[PDB]
Amino acid sequence: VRLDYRISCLLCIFKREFDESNSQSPGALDFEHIEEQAEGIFGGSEENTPLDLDDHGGRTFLRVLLHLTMHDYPPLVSGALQLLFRHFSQRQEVLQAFKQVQLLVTSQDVDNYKQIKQDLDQLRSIVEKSELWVYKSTSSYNYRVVKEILIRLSKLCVQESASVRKSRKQQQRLLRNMGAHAVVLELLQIPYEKAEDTKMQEIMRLAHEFLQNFCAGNQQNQALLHKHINLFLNPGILEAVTMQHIFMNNFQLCSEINERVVQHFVHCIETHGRNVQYIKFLQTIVKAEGKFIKKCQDMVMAELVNSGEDVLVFYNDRASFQTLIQMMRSERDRMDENSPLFMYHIHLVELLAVCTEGKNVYTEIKCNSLLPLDDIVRVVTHEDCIPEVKIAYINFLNHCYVDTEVEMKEIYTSNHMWKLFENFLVDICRACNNTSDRKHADSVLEKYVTEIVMSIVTTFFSSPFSDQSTTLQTRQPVFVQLLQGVFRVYHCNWLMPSQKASVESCIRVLSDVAKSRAIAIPVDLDSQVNNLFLRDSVLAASRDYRNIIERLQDIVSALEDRLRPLVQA
């Protein structure tokens, strides 16, 4: 009771001191005066205290406690000396009394905190006794209780919207303060068996899902789970997905990763086979927050080169080409397989396309060596090529052979790019025909045509040397037909503002190219192109509360620093 009274008194002094700063806000406090006021209650000033229990400075209390020890009753001896140690250590135990606290005013929050307080306690109790009921009835009760605990934890810290994963920042930081991860981690690494247990697998999956929820969109949670990265280096799917989710949109983490993670994932690919999850993790790590890391691309390219053709599986030879041809037919429809076969190849080629981005000569040379342009044109020109192939394949072609620090002249002299443009026109016509059925439109092909088909053309024509290539003078009708198809795509009413802006910019680029080459565009096309060219107090209180938390952390650090000599005394 005395300890709680001291805590209350110090908190009252603390809030009284911040009362002035609330009106003052410029914002700094007088830590020395607060420290002096706080240090007076503990004693040591030689005028006694009402908090003293004998009005004699504890002399009588000490005499009693020592005289309660030489008796032959062991419980009495234990109680007496425990009281002694608690008496001599009052200030530090008060310090850890602050080192625990939490809860600001708001709403049902009041009963949400009570609901989540005992769930973690019972989870800790079950984890401690997990070895007792583990299979090597109490077991079923523990299973259902922990399943409910994990489900509640996952669904209480997440603001479940219609189709957007929204996380409540306040709930995330409250769970951080409570220490949910500090028990779930030990739940992950309990000893178990995998041959004859499946409910354990369900609990393990729930734990992984809850960890992914706890780090969904929160930078602090990802940064704190970064210390326990060494526990997640497993060839399993769930560990890979968790490492993906804690690395999403994290530039500073991606900039500070040792090569151990990428080398471990490459070795996992080599041993446990080619899996989509590893490639997705590589995609997440290579580029973060829209910014590509040169060191990341260099290390992933070195890793894949060291791995060799075991990881890099290419269907270049006609013997493999025909197998790919008949395997596409099985790949048709909604047939993903979620791991083997062709989607791995797709994700690998998006990996190469993303790693090549940034005018990186080191990546560009390797990508050029791995896949020739003749193979690229033979792959794209085949009628079997579905838009799922085309998106990533054309993206990689554009990102490797156009956006280059050092240009290659083979893509500026060959005539197969006109065949590519013819294929693009065919895809544009197919999209325009698909526009008549909005209810069952092929969204993948429409997105491909709207973004990639004009993106590659714009990137190719942006270079000033593209106009210098006089190969188009014999194929002007192809260029005007491509422009007409792009504008017909612009005629669609399902254009996203991003898609509409991309199409308009590509039309502008084509018009600039025509002006540079003095190409006589159609009168109607020219006319239409010319026409186209022609919380107030609540948020403040919350921010002030975060300031209060930081300032009280600094304050308790200051008191601990100044009390260490008194504690030792």
């Binding site: 040591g44 400075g57 504890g58 000599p565």
Partner: peptide, 29 residues
């Protein structure tokens, strides 16, 4: 200087220890 603060802390702790010993043992001559 950090030695100055260390000496200040040392003398504060020594004074606290002396006053606590005086309070507990009492005036013994």
């Amino acid at each position: 200087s950090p030695p100055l603060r260390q000496l200040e802390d040392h003398k504060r702790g020594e004074a606290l220890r002396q006053i606590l010993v005086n309070r507990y043992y009492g005036n013994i001559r």
